[PDB]
């Protein structure tokens with residue numbers, strides 16, 4: 001296999017960032033996230049996740065994420081992102097603070113569910129439900145590894 | 146490229162350590178992310194923390 005840490009071999013798209021470092025950069029990126037975005041681990045470690053955004057990315061939506069991060073709360077949005085070679089995809093994204101025992105935020109987990117289109121109605125509610133559950137499982141798993 | 150193969154290799158090796166809790170592991174990866182030139186020192190020190198916390 002590759003040089004992923006064991007945590008990064010969990011078969012979901014996510015990255016984990018450290019808000020205690022300047023500009024809240026990625027410290028983990030799953031192999032699945034790397035396959036999705038076409039980036040290698042080498043070129044995105046230590047970088048803010050905002051490199052995923054491009055011309056069509058709604059800036060108000062991105063602001064919704066940053067508001068959540070500043071307040072150390074979770075959020076779910078749908079935004080347009082871009083692969084390394086610049087190919088558009090819809091990203092049903094979920095952010096959630098990773099806390100320790102006493103409830104203090106230590107890191108951020110971010111989960112991506114990729115799609116060719118903006119999901120709406122039932123299909124979006126189903127989507128929101130799923131990635132929240134995935135984010136919960138990833139949190140739980142990281143604490144075991 | 147700050148995150149050459151050696152850095153990545155050390156990084157993988159820190160996470161293999163059996164006696165570190167998830168915070169301790171996350172902290173070393175984070176320090177390595179922030180200061181890649183200290184990878185070897187970080188792995189060596191992680192191993193000492195590992196050896197000092199037997200089950």
Ligand SMILES: Cc1cc2nc3c(=O)[nH]c(=O)nc-3n(C[C@H](O)[C@H](O)[C@H](O)COP(=O)(O)O)c2cc1C
Pocket residue numbers: 015016017024048049050052053062063065066069079081091093095108109110111112
């Ligand atoms: C854990 C985590 C995962 C993130 N994942 C994405 C992502 O997949 N796509 C994206 O466009 N932004 C993502 N972001 C958002 C950017 O990192 C950043 O928070 C956002 O662009 C707001 O910051 P800015 O206004 O300074 O650019 C993520 C942030 C965090 C903390």
Ligand SMILES: [Cl-]
Pocket residue numbers: 004005006157
């Ligand atoms: Cl591994």
Ligand SMILES: [Cl-]
Pocket residue numbers: 001009
């Ligand atoms: Cl694997």
Ligand SMILES: [Cl-]
Pocket residue numbers: 023024048069
């Ligand atoms: Cl950020």
